Structure formats: structure tokens, C-alpha cells
Design an enzyme around this catalytic site. Sequence first.
Site, PDB file in Angstrom:
ATOM      1  N   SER A 133       0.861  -1.171  -0.223  1.00  0.00           N
ATOM      2  CA  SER A 133       0.241   0.033  -0.296  1.00  0.00           C
ATOM      3  C   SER A 133       0.479   1.223   0.258  1.00  0.00           C
ATOM      4  O   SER A 133       0.585   2.323  -0.347  1.00  0.00           O
ATOM      5  CB  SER A 133      -0.720   0.599   1.104  1.00  0.00           C
ATOM      6  OG  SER A 133      -2.457  -1.130   0.689  1.00  0.00           O
ATOM      7  N   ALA A 153       1.558  -3.730   4.314  1.00  0.00           N
ATOM      8  CA  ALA A 153       1.757  -5.319   4.138  1.00  0.00           C
ATOM      9  C   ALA A 153       1.368  -5.488   3.185  1.00  0.00           C
ATOM     10  O   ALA A 153       0.262  -5.391   2.883  1.00  0.00           O
ATOM     11  CB  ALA A 153       0.942  -5.599   5.576  1.00  0.00           C
ATOM     12  N   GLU A 162      -5.467  -3.265  -6.745  1.00  0.00           N
ATOM     13  CA  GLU A 162      -5.650  -4.870  -5.415  1.00  0.00           C
ATOM     14  C   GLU A 162      -6.767  -5.279  -5.685  1.00  0.00           C
ATOM     15  O   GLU A 162      -7.838  -5.530  -6.902  1.00  0.00           O
ATOM     16  CB  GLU A 162      -6.149  -3.474  -4.375  1.00  0.00           C
ATOM     17  CG  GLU A 162      -5.242  -2.329  -3.903  1.00  0.00           C
ATOM     18  CD  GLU A 162      -3.872  -2.410  -3.062  1.00  0.00           C
ATOM     19  OE1 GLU A 162      -4.033  -3.883  -3.059  1.00  0.00           O
ATOM     20  OE2 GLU A 162      -3.545  -1.918  -2.930  1.00  0.00           O
TER      21      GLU A 162
END
EC number: 3.5.2.6
Length: 263
Positions: A45, A212, A141
Site C-alpha cells: 500500500s 503489508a 488491488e
Amino acid sequence: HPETLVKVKDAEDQLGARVGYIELDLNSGKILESFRPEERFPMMSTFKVLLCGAVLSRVDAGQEQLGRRIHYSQNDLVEYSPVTEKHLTDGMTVRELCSAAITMSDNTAANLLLTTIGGPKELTAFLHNMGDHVTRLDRWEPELNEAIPNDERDTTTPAAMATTLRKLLTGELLTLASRQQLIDWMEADKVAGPLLRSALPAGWFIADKSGAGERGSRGIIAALGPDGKPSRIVVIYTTGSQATMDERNRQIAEIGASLIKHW
Ligand SMILES: [Xe]
Ligand SMILES: [Xe]
Ligand SMILES: [Xe]
């Protein structure tokens, strides 16, 4: 400081994994400490700050407006969308989508923003054109978090990321208003509490973005300094460890304590 590099080495040995590290003077642009500066790590991110940098560059050029409202579908919602899942009916402005992507790390917000600029290839083209020929975004994503060993997709180096963030925050690329907005979003980060923030003395400034992903991937990028004013950029990445989130958090916070201790 040599002690901080020891902590980084400590972290490598305890996590059983590579750690990359950069301290960069924000004013002079000088690299103060480095560890594995030319090695690649998944951005996770942390790429969302670069993404909104690209968005703000389009706002500056008039190709985008912060108040433009985007509507989207239930189908658009991917894993971890704490803000965007709340606005199926009313939509969200570009400004709200960047706030969600940076302060909450909202995944659907990041995908919607990627669509506005033309996708991962166009984010990479943006970075290329501001002189970062190293960092690359390839996927959306949440697949960009896969962190397959030796897979170079969706990676940066600590040195590339540190210098790119310095340029976005303090360089010539963005207008003064867009620079301030980017750092304002980062200062309002709500999902990096156990990391550098946990070592931060009262009255210090920090603007950051954590990440993460799979296979032990963890990291953070930050501008911080005493006296309520950033003066330093710090980048920390790790990938490959089987360690828990909590341990990876504490390693980063421990590196933070030493950086602060030897400021
Ligand atoms: Xe900054
Ligand atoms: Xe810190
Ligand atoms: Xe770390």
C-alpha cells in the site's frame, strides 16, 4: 547512525528476511543511512502515495478536479474497502478517494483512482517521467500484494522510493497546494499506529504511509522531524519473513526508536 543500521541488521536476523532502509535529508537531499538501497521490495500500500501524486499532477494540469464525483458498483468493491463500501449510493469525490486510499489504505479507492489515471502502466509512466526508472506498478488491488519471491512486479527499491517521495513532497513536480495536500493526507494516516508513530516523541511531525502484503511483506514511508516540522524521509521495507504482523510491527518501531534516538 551506525546504531540504527545495527537495528536493521538485528531485524534481518530476527525476521529471517531482507530489510531495506533509507534515511534521506529532506532539505539537502543527502542520503544519511542506507541498507540494501538497490534491492527490490514489494511496495504494497505504500504505492498509494505515488498514485495520489499522479492524481494531483493531473489536478494541477486541469485533467482532473479534486471535487469531481465518481460513482461505482458493488462489483468494484475488493477486499479491505472500509470507506468506499459506505458510498455506493452517493459516490465519492476524487479528494475523498485519495483521503481513503492514504489515511485508511482503502483498496477499492486505490483501484478507482488507478482507473482515473489509466492504470498501473500509467502510474509507472508517471514515475518514469519524473525520473524514477526503477519503481514499477503492474497490478491492481489486491493482487499487487502477492510478493512472490524474485517477482519484480509491483516493487520499488528503498533508494528509488525515498527519492521519489522527496520529489513528490518537496520537489518541483507538484504545485505548492498539491504538495501540501499530499503531505496532509499522509499526516492523517490512521493505519500505521504501531510503526514509526509508536517511537515518535510528543511534538514531532510525521506524515506516513504503511503497507503489508503476502509472504511477510511489511513497510512504511515517512517524512518526519522534531518541532512539528518534517526534516527527514525514512523508508523501510521487508519481505520473505514468516513472522507475525505484530513482530514485523515491533521491528519497524525498534528501527524507529534508534533513528529518533540518534537524530
Ligand atoms: Xe515533507
Ligand atoms: Xe520514528
Ligand atoms: Xe523491518
